[PDB]
Amino acid sequence: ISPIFQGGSYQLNNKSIDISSLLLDKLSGESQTVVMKFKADKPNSLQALFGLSNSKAGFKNNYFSIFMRDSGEIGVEIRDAQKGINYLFSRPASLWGKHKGQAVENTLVFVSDSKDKTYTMYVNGIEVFSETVDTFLPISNINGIDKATLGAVNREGKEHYLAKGSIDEISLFNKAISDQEVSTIPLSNPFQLIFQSGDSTQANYFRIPTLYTLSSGRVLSSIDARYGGTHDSKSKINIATSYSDDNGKTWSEPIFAMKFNDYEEQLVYWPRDNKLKNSQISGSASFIDSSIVEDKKSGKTILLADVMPAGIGNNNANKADSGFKEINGHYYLKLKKNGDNDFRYTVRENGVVYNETTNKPTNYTINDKYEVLEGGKSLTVEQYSVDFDSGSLRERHNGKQVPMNVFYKDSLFKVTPTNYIAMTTSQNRGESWEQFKLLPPFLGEKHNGTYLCPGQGLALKSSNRLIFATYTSGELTYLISDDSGQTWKKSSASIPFKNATAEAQMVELRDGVIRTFFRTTTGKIAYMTSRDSGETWSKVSYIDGIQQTSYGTQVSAIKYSQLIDGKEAVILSTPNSRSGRKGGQLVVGLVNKEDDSIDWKYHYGIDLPSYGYAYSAITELPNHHIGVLFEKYDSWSRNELHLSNVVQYIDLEINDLT
Numbered sequence: 187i188s189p190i191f192q193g194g195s196y197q198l199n200n201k202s203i204d205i206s207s208l209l210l211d212k213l214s215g216e217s218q219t220v221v222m223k224f225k226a227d228k229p230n231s232l233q234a235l236f237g238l239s240n241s242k243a244g245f246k247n248n249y250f251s252i253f254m255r256d257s258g259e260i261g262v263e264i265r266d267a268q269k270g271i272n273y274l275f276s277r278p279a280s281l282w283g284k285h286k287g288q289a290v291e292n293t294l295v296f297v298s299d300s301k302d303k304t305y306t307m308y309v310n311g312i313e314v315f316s317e318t319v320d321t322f323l324p325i326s327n328i329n330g331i332d333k334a335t336l337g338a339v340n341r342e343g344k345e346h347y348l349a350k351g352s353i354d355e356i357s358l359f360n361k362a363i364s365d366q367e368v369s370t371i372p373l374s375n376p377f378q379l380i381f382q383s384g385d386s387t388q389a390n391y392f393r394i395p396t397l398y399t400l401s402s403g404r405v406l407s408s409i410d411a412r413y414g415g416t417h418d419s420k421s422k423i424n425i426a427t428s429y430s431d432d433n434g435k436t437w438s439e440p441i442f443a444m445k446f447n448d449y450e451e452q453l454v455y456w457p458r459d460n461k462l463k464n465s466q467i468s469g470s471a472s473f474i475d476s477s478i479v480e481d482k483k484s485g486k487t488i489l490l491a492d493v494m495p496a497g498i499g500n501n502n503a504n505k506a507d508s509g510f511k512e513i514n515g516h517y518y519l520k521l522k523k524n525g526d527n528d529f530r531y532t533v534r535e536n537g538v539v540y541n542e543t544t545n546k547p548t549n550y551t552i553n554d555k556y557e558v559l560e561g562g563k564s565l566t567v568e569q570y571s572v573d574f575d576s577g578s579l580r581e582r583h584n585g586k587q588v589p590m591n592v593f594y595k596d597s598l599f600k601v602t603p604t605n606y607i608a609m610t611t612s613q614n615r616g617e618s619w620e621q622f623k624l625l626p627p628f629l630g631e632k633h634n635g636t637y638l639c640p641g642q643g644l645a646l647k648s649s650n651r652l653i654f655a656t657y658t659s660g661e662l663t664y665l666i667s668d669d670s671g672q673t674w675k676k677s678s679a680s681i682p683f684k685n686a687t688a689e690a691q692m693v694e695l696r697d698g699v700i701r702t703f704f705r706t707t708t709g710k711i712a713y714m715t716s717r718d719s720g721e722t723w724s725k726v727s728y729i730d731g732i733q734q735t736s737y738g739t740q741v742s743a744i745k746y747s748q749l750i751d752g753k754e755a756v757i758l759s760t761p762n763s764r765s766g767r768k769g770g771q772l773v774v775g776l777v778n779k780e781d782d783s784i785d786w787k788y789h790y791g792i793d794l795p796s797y798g799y800a801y802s803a804i805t806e807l808p809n810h811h812i813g814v815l816f817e818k819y820d821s822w823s824r825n826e827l828h829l830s831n832v833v834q835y836i837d838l839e840i841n842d843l844t
Contacts, residue, residue: 191357220236416827488671529602773788
């Protein structure tokens with residue numbers, strides 16, 4: 187179909203543009219599509235890009251609009267007072283503002299489909315909403331429409347929602363164009379997607395990105411594939427990975443690094459309304475918060491993540507139990523059998539389930555997948571699926587049998603309901619992953635697992651030492667392995683915070699000198715230093731010059747391989763805002779060789795101060811560019827839950843930052 191209207195290079199400077207003569211008599215039929223390429227790097231708080239309205243006195247509620255907010259939210263209003271219809275559809279965090287010093291051309295496609303009674307919005311090739319209604323209102327059939335407007339809506343002769351921005355191209359069609367046709371519209375995106383809705387994971391949500399450049403030049407990414415909306419555990423969440431062999435230009439179809447199968451892998455549109463948005467999958471085991479490192483000795487890639495048994499998360503995990511029993515200097519996973527009111531069993535060498543009351547072994551064994559065997563035969567459980575067909579969340583058996591796992595709700599033998607850390611390895615740089623193993627407890631029998639710091643582990647340059655940061659109440663607990671992750675020890679470092687979410691990432695400033703940057707509850711990023719390869723740790727200092735909220739946000743950090751201004755450089759990635767998870771920046775610091783102090787000299791704004799930026803991953807690509815994979819939304823805001831395709835990847839050069 188040809189457009190009935192096409193126009194371009196409109197400048198919106200707080201003054202609307204009338205296109206009524208050009209457009210209104212071209213409108214026909216009850217289905218329409220609007221395609222609009224626009225820039226808005228200095229938006230007003232609330233502004234309309236396009237309006238169709240009845241401008242006459244007494245008809246102020248008869249209009250259609252496409253609007254945005256300076257938070258990056260996009261939406262439409264479709265209103266007719268005589269028909270008794272007032273629709274408002276929107277989604278937060280749907281826009282880009284600037285990239286590399288230049289306003290981004292956003293490509294918006296809005297489809298108004300009378301036959302399917304559905305309104306669908308795409309921005310930058312991402313479907314941000316699709317809503318079906320019982321009573322359809324064609325945007326062309328609003329009673330008394332007499333104005334078509336760019337950069338405002340004319341209501342009763344006055345300009346409402348005045349815009350600052352530009353519309354480089356706008357087209358309208360008297361047809362609801364198909365999803366196929368939409369996908370052929372050229373985009374001008376500053377970002378790409380690695381993980382996305384409808385991919386191999388079948389998770390509709392993604393959180394907690396990581397990146398790591400392997401010695402072969404392959405760039406590996408891990409992520410939480412989150413199924414029950416964006417909620418932290420308790421939920422259903424798997425850990426997925428993808429890699430790039432061309433410096434981040436293209437990425438492999440994702441595979442799982444860690445997965446559970448007690449619940450179906452379902453792509454679900456999680457409700458965003460206030461009544462149901464806290465709906466949470468409550469019977470599923472999950473993984474959460476992954477971290478990756480490469481081992482020089484074995485050549486293996488190592489991935490760690492937290493593990494949550496069925497229905498467990500931070501909120502309800504037993505704080506005073508590691509889930510292990512010490513039996514002469516060795517720790518064994520405890521198990522509770524169906525019917526018991528105590529944990530009367532342990533898992534021993536070769537997976538033999540032992541009875542503790544009698545110190546007898548049983549006829550049960552645990553395989554390498556943590557699955558229950560009886561007499562060597564696989565036991566099974568029935569899988570669950572979730573649905574909202576009743577109008578609220580239901581989790582119901584689905585007729586499919588899967589192997590019985592000790593982390594499952596329905597298992598004959600069940601682990602302690604607390605958090606664990608697991609490890610898996612890959613011998614083919616992310617093409618496949620081994621079955622995970624649990625790490626032992628590090629803080630004793632009666633302390634829950636520490637929490638893994640997401641992102642990267644650290645492989646020291648001059649040895650085979652591997653370090654993963656974790657945190658718990660009152661300290662960072664570094665996990666150290668010198669034998670390819672076969673065995674681990676802890677190195678504890680006190681921090682002046684009780685129950686902080688002290689997410690920490692490390693850089694090696696020089697040989698054996700590690701600086702750890704971490705989240706706090708003070709509004710400043712903190713740091714500490716080791717000069718003995720992680721054995722001992724300095725007191726805590728704070729960075730002034732970067733602001734975080736009271737609750738804080740993960741910070742990612744790398745040591746750049748090249749000198750900047752003749753100095754060694756560290757790059758940090760974090761929101762810079764005392765108010766919310768927004769105003770993303772890369773901050774380049776130069777190391778003072780005399781004392782290892784860091785002068786934070788350059789700040790690069792990843793997008794507008796008001797646009798969302800939360801957890802992030804950064805890596806130096808093999809070509810010395812910087813790859814950034816990040817949550818482009820406010821992941822703390824209870825208004826921005828359950829958004830799809832907000833974890834996004836960009837490529838930057840040092841020259842862009844400085």
